[PDB]
Each structure stands twice: as structure tokens, then as C-alpha cells.
Design a protein around this ligand. Structure first.
Ligand SMILES: Nc1nc2sc(CCCc3csc(C(=O)N[C@@H](CCC(=O)O)C(=O)O)c3)cc2c(=O)[nH]1
Ligand SMILES: NCC(=O)N[C@@H]1O[C@H](COP(=O)([O-])[O-])[C@@H](O)[C@H]1O
Length: 200
């Protein structure tokens, strides 16, 4: 399966996906890295890995569908089968999500359905959970509500900040998101006809 990785920043999840998809048994290949922001370190990680990069600055587009259509063009150009959102921070438009229904994965730094949104760690610490985690889910139109592929719990330690908690959670993220990509790329998991996760 041909994979596009959409990034917005540092790209540590991208790096974990690169490493896993170069394993001999990997069923996924990363063929393009799209960043909506220039000079983010994720572009350098891809360039050091030989992977083509495209920057598609969302601020240059009139609305969301024009920005998404620009992404979709690169995806068709590279004949992409699966899209991974790895720290990509722009909410995607309905028609784009519908087109890629069942082919788009997102990594979210909480145990969904808890702490949806852009600052899951802040919410987790504010709430005082002692267990958080990360979620790989299929992207549905409703943000952070698509079907869940894999999760992994991560303890919150006394004294944790966003810095120490997200560093611990990212260790789990870099496990389940390569695993989740492999499940989908190998056709082991799909969004079923009933819309829930189907382990075929
Ligand atoms: N249809 C649909 N689109 C998307 S995009 C995505 C991955 C990112 C999740 C996210 C969760 S809050 C936030 C967000 O607030 N984005 C802001 C920009 C803030 C920033 O630049 O840091 C905005 O777009 O205005 C993005 C998941 C997802 C989905 O599940 N369903
Ligand atoms: N709403 C999604 C979200 O908050 N994304 C989170 O941003 C970080 C990006 O790190 P990276 O750029 O090093 O992969 C990751 O923790 C990812 O789960």
C-alpha cells in the first residue's frame, strides 16, 4: 500500500512510520510527506530518508475545500492508497474525508473518546487522570470520532507536565501507529460495511 504522511511539525511519528515501513515485512510504503507548514523538522526527516516532500501552506487558500483539493492533487499524483495524519493539525473538509473514508489514519494523544481536540495533554492533566494514552483511529468527518484501530495506555506520573507526559505518550504513539498502519496496509483491518472496525 502506498502511503502519504501529512505532518505539521516535528515529525517524530513520521520518523517511527519511516523506520517501520522499511522493515522487510512492511506492507506499507511511504511515498510522499506533505506538510502544511514550511521549515518544520518533519520535512528534514523525510528528506534525510529519501522521501519526496510537498509543502501546501493552508494560509494561501480561500477555505478548507480549496486547501484539501490541493492535498488530494498530490495524493492522486503519487497514487496514494492510505493517508496517515502524523501531527497534522488542520481539520479536514467533509468531501475530502468522505473520499478517503476507510483509507485515512490519525494519531491522537489521548485514549479517545476522552480529551478530543488540540490539547489532549493539557486536558488530561487538568482533569487529573492517572492513565492516559494514545489512539489511532480512522478519520471520520466528526473530529477525533472515527473508528478506533489501536490504543495504548500510558501512566500519568505525579508532577507530570505537558512536556514529560507527551514524551511518555509519544513512546506509545511510535508503537501503535506503525502497528496500525501495518494492520490497514495489509488488509488485516478495514472500516467494515457496518462502519465499525472489521478484522478481516
Ligand atoms: N473531519 C476530520 N478532520 C481531521 S484532521 C485530524 C488531525 C488533527 C486533529 C485536530 C484536533 S483539533 C484540531 C485543530 O484545532 N486544528 C486547527 C488548527 C490548530 C493548529 O494549527 O495547531 C484548525 O484546523 O483550525 C485538529 C483529525 C480529523 C478528524 O478526525 N476528522
Ligand atoms: N490532534 C492531534 C495531535 O494533537 N497530534 C499530536 O501531535 C504530536 C505530533 O508529534 P510529531 O510531529 O513529533 O509526530 C503527536 O503527539 C500527535 O499525537
Amino acid at each position: 500500500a502506498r502511503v502519504a504522511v501529512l505532518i505539521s511539525g516535528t515529525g517524530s511519528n513520521l520518523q517511527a512510520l519511516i523506520d517501520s515501513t522499511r522493515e522487510p515485512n512492511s506492507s506499507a510504503q511511504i511515498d510522499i510527506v506533505i506538510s502544511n507548514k514550511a521549515a518544520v523538522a518533519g520535512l528534514d526527516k523525510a528528506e534525510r530518508a529519501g522521501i519526496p516532500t510537498r509543502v501546501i501552506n493552508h494560509k494561501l487558500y480561500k477555505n478548507r475545500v480549496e486547501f484539501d483539493s490541493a492535498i488530494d492533487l498530490v495524493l492522486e499524483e503519487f497514487s496514494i492508497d492510505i493517508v496517515c495524519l502524523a501531527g497534522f493539525m488542520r481539520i479536514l473538509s467533509g468531501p475530502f474525508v468522505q473520499k478517503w473514508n476507510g483509507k485515512m489514519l490519525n494519531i491522537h494523544p489521548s485514549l479517545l473518546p476522552s480529551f478530543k481536540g488540540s490539547n489532549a495533554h493539557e486536558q488530561a492533566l487538568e482533569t487529573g487522570v492517572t492513565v492516559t494514552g494514545c489512539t489511532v483511529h480512522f478519520v471520520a468527518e466528526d473530529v477525533d470520532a472515527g473508528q478506533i484501530i489501536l490504543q495504548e495506555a500510558v501512566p500519568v506520573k505525579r508532577g507530570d507536565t505537558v512536556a514529560t507526559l507527551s514524551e511518555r505518550v509519544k513512546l506509545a504513539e511510535h508503537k501503535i501507529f506503525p502497528a496500525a498502519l501495518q494492520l490497514v496496509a495489509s488488509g488485516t483491518v478495514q472500516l467494515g460495511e457496518n462502519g465499525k472496525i472489521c478484522w478481516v
